[PDB]
Amino acid sequence: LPITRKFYAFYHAPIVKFWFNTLAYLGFLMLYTFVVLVKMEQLPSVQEWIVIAYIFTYAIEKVREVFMSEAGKISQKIKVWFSDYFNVSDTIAIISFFVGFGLRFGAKWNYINAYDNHVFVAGRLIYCLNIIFWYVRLLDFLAVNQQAGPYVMMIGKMVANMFYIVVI
Amino acid sequence: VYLQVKAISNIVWKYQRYHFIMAYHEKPVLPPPLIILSHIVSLFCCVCKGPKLFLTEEDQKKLHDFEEQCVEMYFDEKDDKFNSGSEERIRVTFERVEQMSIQIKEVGDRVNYIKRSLQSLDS
Amino acid sequence: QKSWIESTLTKRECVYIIPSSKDPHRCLPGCQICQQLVRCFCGRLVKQHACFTASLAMKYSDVKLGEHFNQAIEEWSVEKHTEQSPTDAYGVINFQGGSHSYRAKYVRLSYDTKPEIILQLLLKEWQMELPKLVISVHGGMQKFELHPRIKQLLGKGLIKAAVTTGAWILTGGVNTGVAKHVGDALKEHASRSSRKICTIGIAPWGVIENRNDLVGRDVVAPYQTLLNPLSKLNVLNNLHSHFILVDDGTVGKYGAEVRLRRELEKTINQQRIHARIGQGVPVVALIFEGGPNVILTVLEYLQESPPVPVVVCEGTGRAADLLAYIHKQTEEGGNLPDAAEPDIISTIKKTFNFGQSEAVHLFQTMMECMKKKELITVFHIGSEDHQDIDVAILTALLKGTNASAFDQLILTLAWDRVDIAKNHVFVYGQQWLVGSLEQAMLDALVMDRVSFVKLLIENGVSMHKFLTIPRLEELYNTKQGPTNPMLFHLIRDVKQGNLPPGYKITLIDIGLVIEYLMGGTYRCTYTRKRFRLIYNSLETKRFPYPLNELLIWACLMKRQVMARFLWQHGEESMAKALVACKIYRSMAYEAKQSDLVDDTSEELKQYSNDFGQLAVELLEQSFRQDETMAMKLLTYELKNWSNSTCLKLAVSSRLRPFVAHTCTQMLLSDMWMGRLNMRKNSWYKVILSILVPPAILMLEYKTKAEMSHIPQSQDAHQMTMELPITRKFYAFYHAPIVKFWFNTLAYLGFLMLYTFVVLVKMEQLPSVQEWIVIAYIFTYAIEKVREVFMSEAGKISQKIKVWFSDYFNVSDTIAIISFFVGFGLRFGAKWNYINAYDNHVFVAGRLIYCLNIIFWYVRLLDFLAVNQQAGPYVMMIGKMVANMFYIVVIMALVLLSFGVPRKAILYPHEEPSWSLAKDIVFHPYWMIFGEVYAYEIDVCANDSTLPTICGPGTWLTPFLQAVYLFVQYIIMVNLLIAFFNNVYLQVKAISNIVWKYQRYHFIMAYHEKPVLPPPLIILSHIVSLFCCVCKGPKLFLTEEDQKKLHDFEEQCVEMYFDEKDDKFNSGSEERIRVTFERVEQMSIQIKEVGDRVNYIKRSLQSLDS
Ligand SMILES: CCCCCCCC/C=C/CCCCCCCC(=O)O[C@@H](COC(=O)CCCCCCCCCCCCCCC)COP(=O)([O-])OCC[N+](C)(C)C
Ligand SMILES: CCCCCCCC/C=C/CCCCCCCC(=O)O[C@@H](COC(=O)CCCCCCCCCCCCCCC)COP(=O)([O-])OCC[N+](C)(C)C
Ligand SMILES: CCCCCCCC/C=C/CCCCCCCC(=O)O[C@@H](COC(=O)CCCCCCCCCCCCCCC)COP(=O)([O-])OCC[N+](C)(C)C
Ligand SMILES: CCCCCCCC/C=C/CCCCCCCC(=O)O[C@@H](COC(=O)CCCCCCCCCCCCCCC)COP(=O)([O-])OCC[N+](C)(C)C
Ligand SMILES: CCCCCCCC/C=C\CCCCCCCC(=O)O[C@@H](COC(=O)CCCCCCCCCCCCCCC)COP(=O)([O-])OCC[N+](C)(C)C
Ligand SMILES: CCCCCCCC/C=C\CCCCCCCC(=O)O[C@@H](COC(=O)CCCCCCCCCCCCCCC)COP(=O)([O-])OCC[N+](C)(C)C
Ligand SMILES: CCCCCCCC/C=C\CCCCCCCC(=O)O[C@@H](COC(=O)CCCCCCCCCCCCCCC)COP(=O)([O-])OCC[N+](C)(C)C
Ligand SMILES: CCCCCCCC/C=C\CCCCCCCC(=O)O[C@@H](COC(=O)CCCCCCCCCCCCCCC)COP(=O)([O-])OCC[N+](C)(C)C
Ligand SMILES: CCCCCCCC/C=C\CCCCCCCC(=O)O[C@@H](COC(=O)CCCCCCCCCCCCCCC)COP(=O)([O-])OCC[N+](C)(C)C
Ligand SMILES: CCCCCCCC/C=C\CCCCCCCC(=O)O[C@@H](COC(=O)CCCCCCCCCCCCCCC)COP(=O)([O-])OCC[N+](C)(C)C
Ligand SMILES: CCCCCCCC/C=C\CCCCCCCC(=O)O[C@@H](COC(=O)CCCCCCCCCCCCCCC)COP(=O)([O-])OCC[N+](C)(C)C
Ligand SMILES: CCCCCCCC/C=C\CCCCCCCC(=O)O[C@@H](COC(=O)CCCCCCCCCCCCCCC)COP(=O)([O-])OCC[N+](C)(C)C
């Protein structure tokens, strides 16, 4: 096994792509947690820019996966991908984020004290609610473990089954 | 409901592991901030131009034979599991005791008519 | 050519074109028909020759102008006038038939191929296992059918004989005779022997339906199996697996097999049946339902040098029923009865239409056959003769061939047929040489022939005399049996990491492997002085207990069925089972730590647990007979197994069912007591007596007899000879139960003081209470160092590694280290400020104390774990923490998913700070524990306690909190309840076993712990140390008690096997099947009597008139 072949073997292994995406995702959440918890100025901070870059490119990556799936028919490719819980949530997460960035970034500051401008506030509050989607997607990463993964599947099944007791 | 839900959830977890692992064979190397290079580059290189199992012909031979051998074992172990159960041995025993119970009596009649011999033969 | 066949084996195409016999058929002009009808004496019409050389002979007129001096028309020879050229067909035919293709093979070799090339063709080119037998069936062709009795049986034996012996069945192959009956017998026993019987049809390339469909270089020709009507031609019988078609001559002529097939019958015999064995491969012949050239062939095989014996199954047809009676009218090897010309040659004239023109010629062939009837076995059907011919075929090779019984035995050994040898070789009056049965034992062990080892031990081989050093050396070094590749991997890891070229293994190296596997201080007999000296010098060269040495052999060679057998022989059965468990367990470990391919770590871990269960089951058997003698079995020194005990061996293998067995637990409880009868006493009189020493003199102690089953110290067993006053104090303070409460009271008094110290204000100098606390922990710490550096295993790095495997020793280590950091800061701190807590070094010291004390309250769970009820629950708590981990990880994520939005919405004007980390986790955690923070939920309400937080978006946080608590309480808390409810019983069960198991190490520890507890323990350290400069528990048994105990062990092992045979033979499943089989047998005899009684009816007719 020559030297350069060994790098190929490493970076193209699925286990490596996972931790390589998992570390990037954790670093993504640390920054996006920093952004929502720290005061927000007119222009996005370096942390907020990196967050936007992730979600934009993460979104293109999902469009790649849909339009290259298996079955030729788009209306079948679409219909299967929106059968997974976390792809529905990711779709809501991506769409809601850019509504938020649009309001946050497109808002004109007539008032010097932020939070006088409601369009800005609606943007920031979308961020603070959009981040819930991204912490819950960590359950998808955690679902790679043989012990954890079934319990994640159980939680959704038990919510469905307990519905009528909760209605009462 | 814990045990039945846990059991169904293990099967579903194990099943959805196919689609998850297969996905990471077509995902780019680079992660989603730096993934754009793997998008731009890969796209551009395509304009400049799934996983398969590869088997030698001898390996195809030995694999097709392996499949045939194991199907044969599968039917043999069923016939020998059914023919060796107690329920099947009771009924073949039942039917064979039914048959004998005729022949036992039938011999019983013949031997009772070889008694007719004893009378005629001795005088 | 890319093929050995294409470059070696040949065709025989008739280049020379002899016109047919002489005469044209019809059709007056003789130029069209002299070409067209007139075939070759080759045997085909003229244009089929296609002679690459003489293709233009037919266009002219033909090869070889007509007249040619009639003599020279027979001058055509298969030898001369036939161009040897490539094969042109060798491949894989199939047979669309009884639910399988039933594939096969053909080479289509010429005819005059050398005899060796077949053997090379059969073994490497076709990849066939060399057989242990060759059945060469013969007979006539195109017969209808047999009696439905005989038909079913002939197969049943023919199959059985061939499958049990890896035999080849040589047939003609063509489905018009002998082959038919072979094949029809195969399908009645197919998919049971379809991979052990390699039948071979050595048929010609003449008489066959589609010769041209068989053609094709390396083809998969889909050959038919439909009887092509309107013809006489024959088909290859489908149920054969190999064919050697013989290209010669033509269609119709079928005589070119005797030259080749016979040579194969001669060349297989010159092969050696096995490596360890020197006898040649046998050849047998089963003639059923034969003809005139068979009777020639029978005598041609008997007259041969050496003779090939013959079987004759009477009633199949003419030659069988004939010979069966024609070699019945004779002396044993001599002359015929009163002149037999009339009746013998009568049937020879009736069966074969002769009329004395060929009726003497057969009778002359008969009278030569009867010169050797000892080789003509005959299967007397009707009178259950030799039971389903397999005996009759195989015993024919063991009937008279002046072969010694040593050769009759090896042949059964290679066949793996014990029933044959015991019933036909170990017959009354049989006589043996001195080491013939020894050489047969060496072979059976090297070949893993377990059932022949039994036959030879019974019949009188003695392992005490058989087994020697050089023999036992060989048994390790043989590559002539089911070896273990991993043994070398363990040898080269103990030698130096290297190996010489071949390296014939030595027994000192085996001794070194066992010590590595058995571990600890195990020292093997093979690494001892006397063995190391005598082996250098290589009764002295025997072994006193040879089946201990072969059990080790069989277990290191991964020969389990031989190990189980050898285990049942000899003495010390429970110990041997526990040694085997440890050997396999350690082998399984190093297999799990080697990059080899066949991991064999579940095969070895399963073999370990098989012997593990045997030891447990023998203990239960012994315990059911006599508890007190069974407890002695756990602790008597073995002296053939490094002076260990059965209990220590089980602990070595981490064998919990043995240690957690109630017998072992009963013994541990008795050792806990010491000399104290804690049935007549109460725990509060012990505590009272630790505080009131003179109350020691009014407890109920135990007699030396009541202590007979209990191991003791040497000093403790000498004070058993009598109970004076001072001996009674010894018995009290050295009992483990007393040392416990004596340390437990001191520990509780230690915590009361250390609780006092942390709760009461702290001055510059430590108080009297704090000094006593420091003294305890210092001396408690030395006590732990004593325990580590005096444990068991010599190697510090193993002593260290085991001690830090216990939860509470890790915590004690952290506790001791953290304490003296705290005392150092507390005591070493200089007070620059008069008000304490201005000096931070002092504070850090005191706060370490206040946190270090948590370790010491939790160590009380270790004391509490001495109770049978409490102790399992303590073990459960740790197991449930491990198992609940991922449910709690999910809860932690739900917490953050709420905490981060809450803080962000409510506190939007924050700068970076570590308080942010607190605030996202703090309130969400306390919500889990019944605190909803009711007046902070809606911060804009009138009753809000956070009115200044009221601002834009804050109306979202009640919705978030409502979702959060639904998920945590309604889902996640109750999932955890459901988790614990459903795993409780299996965790409680595992925790009871672990509690019971760790009770060994706990009770054993208190036999080596000092009497005095950890503040006053220093005296027992200083004194004991100093007294050593001035200079384990064993069971002691008298010689008579050793006798009665060794007999007890033997008795209970015998009961153990008897109760198994009688439990299996008395189950309903076993009685149904023996009933099944006996009803199957009767159902034949009932009908058989039914036929006889129906033929005693034939009497009634004839007798009465
Ligand atoms: C398969 C599933 C995954 C993929 C799904 C992907 C597509 C999903 C959908 C995505 C679109 C979501 C909506 C976008 C925003 C519109 C709403 C809005 O309020 O806009 C505002 C910003 O208007 C602007 O023009 C500034 C924003 C710049 C563009 C950023 C958003 C688009 C990027 C898309 C990136 C994703 C693309 C991914 C790759 C192609 C307008 O309001 P305003 O003018 O600020 O306020 C006026 C009042 N004032 C007086 C106070 C100023
Ligand atoms: C198998 C497991 C169990 C066994 C494990 C056993 C070994 C485990 C390890 C044990 C060692 C743990 C660390 C010791 C303390 C060092 C740290 C420290 O801060 O020290 C301080 C005290 O420095 C002194 O010199 C005064 C302390 C006297 C010695 C007491 C500790 C050693 C005893 C060991 C007894 C155990 C031995 C057991 C028997 C051999 C230094 O700080 P300061 O000078 O005070 O402050 C300076 C600032 N000022 C200006 C404010 C003044
Ligand atoms: C069964 C019983 C329930 C019946 C339901 C009927 C729903 C009817 C809907 C009514 C909404 C209108 C009521 C408020 C009037 C508007 C202005 C106002 O006062 O806003 C108030 C907040 O509230 C909001 O700003 C918006 C609240 C929207 C969510 C309401 C629940 C929607 C349904 C369920 C959603 C879940 C998902 C549903 C689907 C599954 C202002 O309050 P404040 O915080 O004190 O702010 C003032 C102080 N400040 C200026 C400093 C900020
Ligand atoms: C998927 C299931 C859906 C469940 C149903 C839908 C959800 C429930 C729907 C509720 C109706 C919506 C209420 C609108 C009220 C507006 C009034 C206002 O001024 O602002 C209020 C809204 O702002 C808040 O922050 C309070 C929102 C209510 C949270 C309810 C959580 C409990 C969930 C229950 C779930 C169980 C449901 C039971 C079954 C139906 C806050 O008032 P304030 O800050 O004090 O403002 C000052 C006013 N003052 C001056 C008078 C003090
Ligand atoms: C997409 C994938 C990303 C992957 C990560 C790698 C790339 C990104 C890495 C680093 C980018 C850092 C940019 C710094 C910009 C300089 C100025 C600055 O912010 O100074 C700050 C110093 O910095 C901090 O306080 C750190 C803030 C980021 C926290 C998360 C980093 C760790 C995770 C990622 C790394 C470990 C990975 C962990 C996972 C294993 C000081 O605070 P402030 O912000 O100036 O204050 C703003 C106040 N205001 C707004 C009110 C005015
Ligand atoms: C510069 C930075 C330097 C540091 C970088 C590195 C830092 C560390 C990085 C990452 C943290 C994890 C490290 C531990 C991994 C253990 C190994 C393992 O077995 O993993 C498993 C986990 O597989 C997963 O997919 C786990 C997903 C992790 C992310 C989820 C976090 C949840 C947080 C929510 C809670 C809130 C907590 C928030 C705390 C604030 C994979 O193995 P398996 O598939 O299960 O194997 C089973 C099959 N077998 C039996 C055949 C083997
Ligand atoms: C800020 C607040 C805190 C943050 C929230 C914490 C994070 C969120 C927590 C947990 C999320 C768990 C992730 C889902 C796991 C996978 C499930 C899945 O694959 O499908 C499941 C569907 O799923 C459902 O029916 C619902 C899934 C749970 C939704 C819970 C939402 C939270 C609020 C709810 C309460 C609101 C009411 C209270 C309001 C007063 C499958 O279920 P099934 O149909 O039986 O099985 C078929 C599966 N199959 C198709 C694959 C074969
Ligand atoms: C290592 C093994 C140890 C074993 C124990 C035996 C040896 C140890 C036994 C006794 C030592 C007592 C020393 C007394 C010193 C005189 C001064 C004094 O302290 O007066 C106190 C009176 O005394 C108390 O208040 C008792 C304090 C100790 C409580 C624990 C004793 C019971 C446990 C053990 C015995 C039962 C065993 C229980 C288990 C079955 C008054 O208070 P002060 O303390 O003066 O106030 C300090 C205030 N200042 C600091 C702010 C200035
Ligand atoms: C394995 C061994 C590891 C530990 C080794 C030993 C470590 C030794 C550690 C430290 C020695 C420190 C010596 C002094 C250093 C200079 C500072 C000084 O003297 O004074 C300063 C001390 O201020 C502090 O904050 C001191 C904190 C140090 C204690 C840390 C304990 C760590 C042990 C963790 C547990 C480990 C457990 C390990 C086992 C698991 C200030 O004091 P002052 O003059 O009063 O100032 C007044 C200021 N004022 C105006 C605000 C009022
Ligand atoms: C001067 C002083 C005078 C007084 C001195 C004397 C005072 C009293 C001294 C001590 C208190 C205990 C006395 C009761 C003993 C009962 C007898 C018994 O059976 O014990 C068992 C307990 O075995 C142990 O190992 C128990 C450990 C006790 C310490 C744990 C305390 C937990 C405190 C934490 C909670 C906080 C409470 C804190 C309270 C503030 C041993 O028996 P066994 O092994 O289970 O037998 C089973 C096998 N069999 C069936 C064959 C039999
Ligand atoms: C001041 C505070 C209060 C005081 C605390 C109260 C006292 C502390 C309480 C209980 C301690 C119980 C003692 C251990 C019992 C024995 C267990 C054992 O032997 O091994 C167990 C291992 O153990 C573990 O994996 C962890 C053990 C429990 C640690 C709990 C720490 C407390 C905090 C945690 C929560 C923090 C998170 C929350 C933070 C927000 C065995 O488990 P296993 O691997 O399945 O089995 C193999 C066993 N075998 C090897 C022998 C075969
Ligand atoms: C997805 C649906 C689309 C969204 C619309 C429909 C949603 C329902 C209803 C409508 C939305 C709420 C409208 C009413 C409030 C407006 C008035 C207002 O100013 O309120 C507040 C700000 O509020 C905001 O700035 C709005 C933020 C909206 C975030 C998105 C809601 C979540 C939808 C998820 C739905 C999922 C349901 C659950 C899942 C089944 C108060 O501001 P203020 O105090 O007046 O400002 C003065 C500040 N100053 C004093 C500093 C100057």
Numbering used by the authors:
A (entry chain D): 839 to 1006
B (entry chain D): 1099 to 1147, 1157 to 1230
C (entry chain A): 3 to 540, 614 to 797, 839 to 1147, 1157 to 1230
Please quote the paper that reports this structure.
First, we determined structures of TRPM7 in the apo state by subjecting the protein purified in glyco-diosgenin (GDN) detergent or reconstituted in lipid nanodiscs to cryo-EM. The corresponding 3D reconstructions resulted in 2.61-Å and 2.19-Å resolution structures. Despite the two structures being nearly indistinguishable, the cryo-EM map for the protein reconstituted in lipid nanodiscs had better overall quality and resolution than the one for the protein purified in GDN. Since all previously published TRPM7 structures represented a single closed state, the nearly perfect superposition of their resolved regions with the corresponding regions in our structures suggests that our apo-state structures also represent the same closed state, TRPM7Closed. We observed excellent protein density in the TMD surrounded by additional density, which allowed us to build models for 18 lipids per TRPM7Closed subunit. Most of these densities have a head-and-two-tails appearance and most likely represent phospholipids. However, two types of putative lipid densities had a shape drastically different from phospholipids, and we modeled them as cholesterol and GDN. Since we did not introduce cholesterol during protein purification, the corresponding densities in our structure most probably represent endogenous cholesterol molecules that interact with the channel in physiological conditions. On the other hand, GDN was used during the extraction step of purification and likely remains attached to the protein despite the following GDN-free reconstitution into lipid nanodiscs. Finally, we inspected TRPM7Closed and found that the vanilloid-like site in this apo-state structure is occupied by an acyl tail of a lipid molecule that protrudes from the base of the S1–S4 bundle.
The transient receptor potential channel TRPM7 is a master regulator of the organismal balance of divalent cations that plays an essential role in embryonic development, immune responses, cell mobility, proliferation, and differentiation. TRPM7 represents a master regulator of the cellular balance of divalent cations and mediates uptake of Zn2+, Mg2+ and Ca2+, which is required for the normal prenatal development and healthy adulthood. The TRPM7 structure represents a tetramer assembled of four identical subunits, with the overall architecture reminiscent of other TRPM channels. Each TRPM7 subunit consists of an intracellular N-terminal domain (NTD, residues 1–789), transmembrane domain (TMD, 839–1146), and cytosolic C-terminal domain (CTD, 1157–1230).
